[PDB]
Amino acid sequence: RTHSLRYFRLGVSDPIHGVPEFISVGYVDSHPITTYDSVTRQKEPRAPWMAENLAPDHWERYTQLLRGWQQMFKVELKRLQRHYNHSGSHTYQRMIGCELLEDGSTTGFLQYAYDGQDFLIFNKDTLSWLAVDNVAHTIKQAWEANQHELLYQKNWLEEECIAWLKRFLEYGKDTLQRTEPPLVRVNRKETFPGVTALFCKAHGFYPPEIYMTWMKNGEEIVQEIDYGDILPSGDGTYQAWASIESNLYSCHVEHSGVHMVLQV
Amino acid sequence: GVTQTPKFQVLKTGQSMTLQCAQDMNHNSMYWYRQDPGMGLRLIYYSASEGTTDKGEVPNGYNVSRLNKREFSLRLESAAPSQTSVYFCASSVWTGEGSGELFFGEGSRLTVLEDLKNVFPPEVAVFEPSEAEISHTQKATLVCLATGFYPDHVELSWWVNGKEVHSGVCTDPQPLKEQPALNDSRYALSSRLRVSATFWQNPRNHFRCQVQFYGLSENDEWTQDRAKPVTQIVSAEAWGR
Amino acid sequence: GQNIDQPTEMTATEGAIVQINCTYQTSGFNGLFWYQQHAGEAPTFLSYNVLDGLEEKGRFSSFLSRSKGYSYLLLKELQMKDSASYLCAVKDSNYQLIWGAGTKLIIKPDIQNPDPAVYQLRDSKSVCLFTDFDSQTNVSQSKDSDVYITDKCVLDMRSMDFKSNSAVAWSNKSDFACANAFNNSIIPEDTFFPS
Amino acid sequence: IQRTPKIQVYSRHPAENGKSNFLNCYVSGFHPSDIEVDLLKNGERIEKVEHSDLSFSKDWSFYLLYYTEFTPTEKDEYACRVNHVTLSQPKIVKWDRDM
Ligand SMILES: *Cc1cnc2nc(N)nc(N)c2n1
Ligand code: NA
Ligand code: NA
């Protein structure tokens, strides 16, 4: 299937009591794998298959790198506040990563946000930064001036990030590449008088990616379907649902290459 | 860009020593390297940004202090002979960026000896052009020899009429060992300045070979009969004939 | 990563071309650097490659092939001043720099009119000078070890557009004369020996 | 632009009174990151409540899972109480009893 690796950074200026100035967290798919923050000042694993397969050298080296990157975020955030003429507490975020698609193709992304809004989006195909406003444009020009760093970034998204992802994917295969099929049921109920509600409910499945829909007479898809979020159940699996309100209805579910139909 | 000191230093085994490095480029990352013949640069310690440092590849015998954003000092707590080396401080804008290059300081030549008693300044001598060369080529080659010095801490230069010259000069890039078998062999360096026969034949032309030697400092105690081999210039000269 | 290989030493002729190779076997790759280091000087940055291709910077170009894991530094129209060590280094996946042991580049001056000879110099208060030989002549070390012989050395009398090779030999011993001073070396058959 | 948290309260497995289960409270879509969450039984804070670390969404918002082991009964009322800078006062979100 499609897997992904990504590293987030959150910087907060003038934080209240109890909020780190800086937090950085890594994920493989939906699973946290690493954590660092300005309070512990240490990078630690957040999955046991990460802890077991990476020697102390790794955590030691990246602890030093993250301290440096923490300092880098702090100063960048100061400059952005200056550009906007902002005071008080603001936030600064970035997301870097890559995906290895099921058909073997790849993607790579690198994005920044100021106060929770898109700010700069890197296009690794033209080696350029997309800016949302004039302040981002100011930063863009600075970053686009350094040709070699743009080349380094493209190489990191396309080659390094993908090789890290394959490495981590192997380490955690018993978790990441397993399949737990959905338990799926349909519930019927007359609600408001005259109104009958159909709910198609799935739970216990992994990976979280699941497709659910309602069909009428096997052909057309029903209009006005309500969708429920894919929610973590807390035991490593997920749950979700889809619902609608004198012909024949059926719920269709696809999960990890297996298709399921529940007729009413 | 990157300023490091001292350029030269002789140490007795067991002595303390601090090497200073400062950079005014507002760089976040600093490094200490040693460079030894026959191998790649080896990282001793580094500081990824202000407020953190860590061991590199060869941290034993050393420690460091990232004093502030500008300064990264290297400390030899108890100098050992194997710490005889050339030390380079470097900085970079950050660490964890692919393309960022290093900016190096000018280097520190450190020589650690069991005993300061083999330290010797050079004897310098100048050898006048062969009359055979002058008739055969219409050119005149002066040769300078700096001999018997130790350690290998010298800088040879030529001065003609009180101004230093570079044209027609070639100095051995490395001194040779006077006792190749010995671990503490003293050294010898040769250099040449070639001028036109005309210029040599002008008796109002003064040629001087100058050798800066870097040896003992004031604080080094000296109780031998022979003159304390302090840092000093030794010269030899010749006039046009 | 683990290792970086570049030749210990290369020698080419003034005005010509030399290519310095660097191969690497590292745990991940975040770019390859070249540095220039003149004897007794600090290293200075020359180039960075991280994607495939060739990047030119004046007389110097640097090439990278990611799939064959190698780089070269290309120097065109070589000059004497290009004599230096050239250091190859790769950033691995953890951004740690891995250094090659460096390549010492030696440039052979193009000697227009070789006039090989051995002169005797007298002290100003002695010494033998082998000089003016062609650049493909090599100076061997001495056998008798109270006899000292130096590397060959190129001087450049700039205002006359004249470069020349030379090497010095000297000794305290009775037996040492200039007629024999360079007898370990293969010197030109027409080497001029003044009496 | 601040975003107020979505608060979803639900059992791990389909709920049945008298049978042991886990009660989840998933708090998501919020910005900025400072947040307080408690699970309540009949109005009173539950002591043994586990939670994930703050997590990061690709839309720059954040999310959290809090949960406790519980055995639902007919008489017991559960809820998730959440405070965030977007809320004047803490928000108490009742469990819909898996209805
Ligand atoms: C913890 C970690 C490790 N490697 C990373 N590499 C990049 N490019 N960015 C981030 N934030 C990383 N975090
Ligand atoms: Na140490
Ligand atoms: Na509030």
XYZ file of N, CA and C in Angstrom, chain C residues 45-141:
291
model
N 36.610 26.288 0.439
C 35.559 25.606 -0.286
C 35.701 25.853 -1.786
N 35.598 24.790 -2.582
C 35.637 24.921 -4.039
C 34.283 24.637 -4.674
N 33.608 23.563 -4.257
C 32.374 23.163 -4.959
C 31.489 22.234 -4.150
N 30.209 22.210 -4.502
C 29.217 21.279 -3.942
C 28.353 20.701 -5.054
N 28.202 19.376 -5.093
C 27.245 18.707 -5.987
C 26.355 17.810 -5.160
N 25.064 17.745 -5.477
C 24.200 16.783 -4.809
C 23.275 16.061 -5.808
N 22.906 16.710 -6.924
C 22.248 15.987 -8.034
C 23.236 15.669 -9.163
N 22.811 14.847 -10.120
C 23.651 14.471 -11.269
C 23.974 15.626 -12.204
N 25.241 15.724 -12.594
C 25.655 16.721 -13.555
C 26.975 17.407 -13.257
N 27.267 18.411 -14.062
C 28.570 19.045 -14.082
C 28.389 20.531 -13.906
N 29.111 21.065 -12.938
C 28.990 22.456 -12.575
C 30.323 23.145 -12.743
N 30.331 24.219 -13.513
C 31.575 24.877 -13.863
C 31.745 26.157 -13.059
N 32.959 26.377 -12.564
C 33.289 27.590 -11.823
C 34.670 28.091 -12.272
N 34.698 28.860 -13.359
C 35.946 29.298 -13.958
C 36.692 28.123 -14.570
N 37.980 28.019 -14.280
C 38.765 26.894 -14.763
C 38.446 25.580 -14.039
N 37.602 25.613 -13.007
C 37.291 24.373 -12.293
C 35.860 23.923 -12.560
N 35.673 22.617 -12.697
C 34.336 22.053 -12.813
C 34.264 20.878 -11.886
N 33.072 20.604 -11.375
C 32.903 19.416 -10.565
C 31.659 18.642 -10.989
N 31.840 17.336 -11.065
C 30.866 16.418 -11.624
C 30.420 15.452 -10.569
N 29.155 15.063 -10.623
C 28.684 14.019 -9.732
C 27.820 13.020 -10.491
N 28.104 11.746 -10.258
C 27.220 10.657 -10.655
C 26.726 9.928 -9.421
N 25.457 10.118 -9.099
C 24.875 9.491 -7.931
C 24.845 7.970 -8.030
N 24.538 7.460 -9.211
C 24.368 6.018 -9.349
C 25.706 5.242 -9.359
N 26.789 5.887 -9.794
C 28.097 5.238 -9.803
C 28.893 5.651 -8.562
N 28.292 6.539 -7.776
C 28.859 7.019 -6.531
C 30.228 7.628 -6.703
N 30.352 8.568 -7.635
C 31.618 9.249 -7.724
C 31.529 10.675 -8.235
N 32.595 11.404 -7.975
C 32.690 12.780 -8.380
C 34.052 12.984 -9.023
N 34.193 13.988 -9.870
C 35.553 14.398 -10.143
C 35.605 15.900 -10.069
N 36.801 16.376 -9.785
C 37.116 17.780 -9.877
C 38.003 17.922 -11.112
N 37.553 18.744 -12.061
C 38.240 18.946 -13.332
C 38.932 20.306 -13.350
N 40.241 20.331 -13.575
C 40.989 21.593 -13.677
C 41.523 21.809 -15.098
N 41.106 22.889 -15.758
C 41.542 23.168 -17.130
C 42.673 24.191 -17.155
N 43.469 24.162 -18.222
C 44.592 25.083 -18.407
C 45.443 25.224 -17.136
N 45.964 24.105 -16.642
C 46.658 24.066 -15.356
C 47.727 25.135 -15.226
N 47.813 25.715 -14.035
C 48.861 26.672 -13.730
C 49.676 26.142 -12.552
N 50.908 26.628 -12.398
C 51.711 26.253 -11.237
C 50.917 26.497 -9.958
N 50.219 27.631 -9.874
C 49.512 28.010 -8.648
C 48.425 27.004 -8.265
N 48.098 26.094 -9.178
C 47.110 25.041 -8.906
C 47.710 23.917 -8.072
N 49.017 23.986 -7.846
C 49.671 23.019 -6.968
C 49.154 23.215 -5.565
N 48.557 22.147 -5.043
C 47.797 22.157 -3.805
C 47.259 20.754 -3.563
N 46.744 20.504 -2.357
C 45.954 19.303 -2.090
C 44.494 19.609 -2.252
N 43.750 18.646 -2.792
C 42.330 18.810 -3.056
C 41.607 17.772 -2.247
N 40.659 18.222 -1.425
C 40.041 17.347 -0.438
C 38.632 17.083 -0.856
N 38.296 15.801 -0.865
C 36.946 15.359 -1.145
C 36.245 15.006 0.169
N 34.977 15.383 0.316
C 34.212 15.045 1.508
C 32.731 14.910 1.203
N 32.105 13.893 1.787
C 30.680 13.659 1.573
C 29.906 13.860 2.861
N 28.750 14.516 2.790
C 27.802 14.519 3.891
C 26.920 13.272 3.876
N 26.939 12.507 4.958
C 26.154 11.289 4.976
C 24.719 11.596 5.381
N 23.926 10.559 5.637
C 22.493 10.784 5.860
C 22.208 11.509 7.168
N 23.176 11.484 8.092
C 23.090 12.240 9.328
C 23.860 13.567 9.314
N 24.237 13.995 8.109
C 24.922 15.259 7.857
C 26.329 15.298 8.438
N 26.875 14.124 8.741
C 28.255 14.031 9.187
C 29.185 14.058 7.982
N 30.229 14.873 8.073
C 31.184 15.001 6.978
C 32.185 13.866 7.004
N 32.301 13.134 5.901
C 33.328 12.099 5.804
C 34.396 12.513 4.810
N 35.635 12.590 5.287
C 36.730 13.188 4.514
C 37.645 12.189 3.779
N 37.905 12.453 2.503
C 38.964 11.740 1.826
C 40.289 12.193 2.412
N 41.320 11.365 2.265
C 42.668 11.704 2.745
C 43.320 12.788 1.884
N 42.644 13.194 0.807
C 43.139 14.279 -0.017
C 44.071 13.825 -1.125
N 44.071 14.596 -2.214
C 44.928 14.385 -3.364
C 45.878 15.557 -3.530
N 47.172 15.290 -3.466
C 48.181 16.315 -3.730
C 48.415 16.465 -5.238
N 48.084 17.636 -5.778
C 48.298 17.876 -7.196
C 49.650 18.563 -7.433
N 50.478 17.902 -8.234
C 51.776 18.409 -8.654
C 51.742 18.831 -10.135
N 52.157 20.064 -10.404
C 52.184 20.597 -11.749
C 53.623 20.641 -12.259
N 53.833 20.071 -13.442
C 55.144 20.050 -14.081
C 55.249 21.246 -15.013
N 56.155 22.182 -14.698
C 56.336 23.328 -15.588
C 56.803 22.868 -16.952
N 56.352 23.557 -17.989
C 56.818 23.300 -19.345
C 58.136 24.021 -19.584
N 59.248 23.290 -19.553
C 60.572 23.916 -19.636
C 61.022 24.093 -21.090
N 61.065 25.343 -21.535
C 61.311 25.662 -22.937
C 62.689 25.235 -23.449
N 63.722 25.560 -22.679
C 65.091 25.281 -23.080
C 65.879 24.665 -21.938
N 65.791 23.336 -21.779
C 66.506 22.688 -20.674
C 68.009 22.867 -20.818
N 68.669 23.308 -19.753
C 70.117 23.483 -19.741
C 70.691 22.808 -18.499
N 70.441 21.495 -18.352
C 70.759 20.780 -17.108
C 72.224 20.963 -16.704
N 72.472 21.181 -15.412
C 73.818 21.435 -14.902
C 73.851 21.353 -13.374
N 75.053 21.177 -12.823
C 75.256 21.129 -11.378
C 76.327 22.129 -10.961
N 75.927 23.167 -10.234
C 76.852 24.225 -9.836
C 77.267 24.087 -8.380
N 78.443 24.603 -8.041
C 78.842 24.665 -6.639
C 78.707 26.085 -6.114
N 77.974 26.231 -5.018
C 77.821 27.524 -4.377
C 78.723 27.591 -3.145
N 79.312 28.754 -2.882
C 80.194 28.900 -1.726
C 79.494 29.712 -0.648
N 79.754 29.380 0.617
C 79.171 30.112 1.744
C 79.625 31.568 1.739
N 78.748 32.450 2.212
C 79.028 33.881 2.290
C 79.819 34.254 3.563
N 80.269 33.238 4.301
C 81.014 33.426 5.547
C 82.276 32.561 5.575
N 79.981 22.786 1.853
C 79.118 23.759 1.182
C 78.056 23.064 0.320
N 77.540 23.776 -0.685
C 76.294 23.393 -1.359
C 76.392 23.142 -2.887
N 75.635 22.143 -3.362
C 75.532 21.774 -4.782
C 74.136 22.034 -5.360
N 74.080 22.665 -6.524
C 72.799 23.007 -7.135
C 72.587 22.310 -8.486
N 71.718 21.297 -8.515
C 71.265 20.699 -9.772
C 70.108 21.549 -10.272
N 70.242 22.129 -11.462
C 69.272 23.120 -11.920
C 69.053 23.084 -13.431
N 67.945 23.686 -13.865
C 67.656 23.914 -15.291
C 67.394 22.646 -16.112
N 67.146 21.521 -15.443
C 66.772 20.297 -16.143
C 65.287 20.283 -16.523
N 64.962 19.444 -17.505
C 63.598 19.230 -17.971
C 62.717 18.598 -16.900
N 61.410 18.840 -16.976
C 60.492 18.470 -15.896
C 60.228 16.976 -15.745
N 60.720 16.156 -16.665
C 60.507 14.724 -16.514
C 61.702 14.071 -15.835
N 62.664 14.885 -15.421
C 63.757 14.404 -14.586
C 63.314 14.301 -13.129
N 63.708 13.219 -12.465
C 63.360 13.036 -11.064
C 64.588 13.025 -10.177
N 64.488 13.690 -9.028
C 65.575 13.737 -8.051
C 65.368 12.708 -6.949
N 66.277 11.746 -6.875
C 66.226 10.732 -5.834
C 66.869 11.219 -4.539
N 66.465 10.606 -3.433
C 67.060 10.884 -2.138
C 68.509 10.377 -2.126
